[PDB]
Symmetry: C3
Amino acid sequence: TVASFLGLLVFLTPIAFILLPPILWRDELEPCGTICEGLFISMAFKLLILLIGTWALFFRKRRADMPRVFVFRALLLVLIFLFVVSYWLFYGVRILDSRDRNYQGIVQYAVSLVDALLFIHYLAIVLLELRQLQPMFTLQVVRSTDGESRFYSLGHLSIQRAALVVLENYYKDFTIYNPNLLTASKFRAAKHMAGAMIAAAARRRDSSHNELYYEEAEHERRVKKRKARLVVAVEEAFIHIQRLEVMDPREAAQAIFPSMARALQKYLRITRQQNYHSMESILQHLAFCITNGMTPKAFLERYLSAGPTLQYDKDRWLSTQWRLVSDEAVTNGLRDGIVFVLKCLDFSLVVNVKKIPFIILSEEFIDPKSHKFVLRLQ
Amino acid sequence: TVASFLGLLVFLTPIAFILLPPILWRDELEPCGTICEGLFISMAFKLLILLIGTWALFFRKRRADMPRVFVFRALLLVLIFLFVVSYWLFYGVRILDSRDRNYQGIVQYAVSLVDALLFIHYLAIVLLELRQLQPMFTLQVVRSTDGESRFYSLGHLSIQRAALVVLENYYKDFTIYNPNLLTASKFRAAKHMAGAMIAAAARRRDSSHNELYYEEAEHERRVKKRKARLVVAVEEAFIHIQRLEVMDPREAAQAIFPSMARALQKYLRITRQQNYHSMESILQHLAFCITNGMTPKAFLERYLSAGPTLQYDKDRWLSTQWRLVSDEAVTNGLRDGIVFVLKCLDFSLVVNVKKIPFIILSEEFIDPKSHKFVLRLQ
Amino acid sequence: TVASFLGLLVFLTPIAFILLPPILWRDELEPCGTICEGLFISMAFKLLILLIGTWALFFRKRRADMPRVFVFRALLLVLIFLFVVSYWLFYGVRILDSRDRNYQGIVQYAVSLVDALLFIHYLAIVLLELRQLQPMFTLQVVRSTDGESRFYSLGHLSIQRAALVVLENYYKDFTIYNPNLLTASKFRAAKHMAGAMIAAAARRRDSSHNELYYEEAEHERRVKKRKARLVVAVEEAFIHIQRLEVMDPREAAQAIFPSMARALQKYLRITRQQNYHSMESILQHLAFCITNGMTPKAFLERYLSAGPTLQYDKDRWLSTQWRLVSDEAVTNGLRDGIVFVLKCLDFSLVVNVKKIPFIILSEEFIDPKSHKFVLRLQ
């Protein structure tokens, strides 16, 4: 490919610096003998180390699209470019155009290339994944809709890369965005829209009958009742088949699903999760749990709670529609007190960054003989 | 030991390459003088760096037994073996059998050995702990019995090493396997075993009296009552002794334990945790909390909830009885959509792996002047 | 500064070793030509790598004050000191006092300095952040007051640095210390202080009327009622302004705050959080949520639950008043079974360390053809 051809060029540059003097001026080489060959062996082993490490840490697909340029990868690519161009420039001007003797020094030049390219690989692992290992900052990530909030520690990242780690943790950690869980507050605010003084109106409101407390208690009671119906239905559904007419787990799932289908439908409607689980999805997860020997409760934990975003179908999450709002340049590093917002189509992740505080530890000595207790009351 | 003797050989190989030419042919050395000694100093400092780093990252006990071979450690050991054997081969064939001059080049050969062995140490830290730093995958780990589920991010690991990290997080994160919390569903399914049409039977079931809702509400009420009794008992037990007859925390624990013992026994029976806490364990934790100045609630948090597996006795967890079920080779790396199962004696951890999605970020500019609000209703 | 001047000296040491032979004895240099210049280029590129990596990982402020000396940073500074002093000593004794020829060897000496100083940078990243990447231990951190407990995995750290990571996770993860949530147990124990036999007294206590169960149920009911009042108040407060008299979010916050202020005050009093939120803090967070387009529930999640310590004001947490109690030297590494206590002014973090167990994995083969199921009951 494009980067693979440049990788082939940067890998064959020391090999070309070795091979060209015995080809272009074969009879002009000084007799090296031992030291040149013992340096070729070190060259080959260091190139093997470089190829294995480059495969291990950089033969992987691009993980994300960021708004501005990855500053550290641009720095590494500019450094590799100026590195290899300066070595080819010195090799063409001061070695090939002069047709040098002392081939041992040419092999030393190629081995210094391999050494400094290994240190470029080391600077790459320093910049790309070791600079943010030490947790310099904390990040409070809050959804703007339901208020679900988790805290994360991050090192020195840019606002781009911090937003990337926040979105990774969003798909892993936050429950999935459900707009149907949000409509009750919207209709309640619109019902207030249907109809000094602002403190007296609040006093008349707080003295009135709280419909919301009793409706939430009654809804929680209905959810517990539908949950108990669902648990009984899924237990008496799983008891209908045996691990051993012979059938595969898909047909066993289709066999036992009509004895749980109505209770699950009523539970997903009362918990407002019915848009998240098609019948095909439930049958695939049912055959999955029947295959792996999972209990009714282990099958049912997918449906009892909300669950994170990566449980669900790949279209229900949408990672290409993320927008990064920031008051400053997103290539700037994190610092104390900045706010950046990760906007999806309906919700947003409001992220404010706080510096992890300077902590002062001190010892104090507790004598283990000073742990004496008396039967007297305290 | 076995690996320690090979470590002594790989550490003494550059030193032997240095020491053998002034011993075997002492009068044949060309006068090096400055450059050889300034290269010995660099050799000694790089060997000190190599010894300190090798102690820091590899002088540690083997952490786990895996089914197949650790592929990266086997690659590193084969690389070290071919490395050192090729250097001894070139040193015996082309240096010792020829009895070379230009000892400066021999010291350069030994320093190139020390350099490439430092880069072997670097390739070791690349392969063993840096390749999986960037979180390529997410892992949904579910117990097959109670359905408890947590999500974890992992990089490029094999299925072996991913299963190892999953088990680390199992002992840290999941509540302990309690088979007594699972018997109610089993007896309920056996009670259904005591006694078109499959949809009508489900309709008659869901219209019947849900015993399960009222039994769960009544059990939760009994657990709250026993919890309140236990809190009162442990508070009035801790008030009987004073931090200051003089006694150590073991005898103070034995003094105040009979005023809390029955309430704790009834709470551990109602929460089905009585097999997990012997009287010796409770007395040791009681003397522990009396020693460290912990409150009754801080003592009691060990017993109120289930708690993770590493709270409990070392025989109650059993890390040697883990079985890895996978449809493919466990030395293969993680990829999107694979399922592997970690089976203990009674339960299993069903782990399905999902690729963390390709995320596209973009900026959008919000003018901070565009945050103007009106008192008008919305 | 102090460390910046020593950094300038260690950076200019190879440059000084290069520049001094053409200045002090200019006419005595042997003609190097190609190889010396091709080694200067490698020197300049490796010094650029060293400067970029040193900026990336070590140009950062000191994060914490520890009781005893950081052992690994002291080892690194002693190593750099003996390193650079030994190189200046050999350069003064055996190069400057002799006024050497073969300047190519002097450039090789300076390049070996730059190489071994890059490996010092590598040993620094090995000791300071790579030795603890592999999770050797688990840590149960419990507050002595309310018993809140979380488990953390750590590698080979000292007790100092483990305590530092524990405090990082304390400010991120534990809910904030609230002494007002603890006074009910203290007054209940003092009420027991107002008034064989120790088992009969416990039997008479556990048979009595449990005031605590009914008071906790009644308090939870009052908290749910005040929460419903607060949700209604904040929704009907946010509906009073529109995103668009024109006003900024501070004045919009001040406009809509008197219609929610009494319900929020009553909720913070019933949940004992009123010392944590001044009116200025609530108005700043209100203007913050009005700015970022957050819902009433997203505004309200700061106040509904306790929340971690870093949500609150910077004086409410106090990172300078931490005391480390340990039975051994805090520079010793973690091992299985040690207990260290992190004491704040009122509470303490009791941390006991357990070794993560030796896990034995094995394969077992499940035939995917062996997943056959029958319609027969099990």
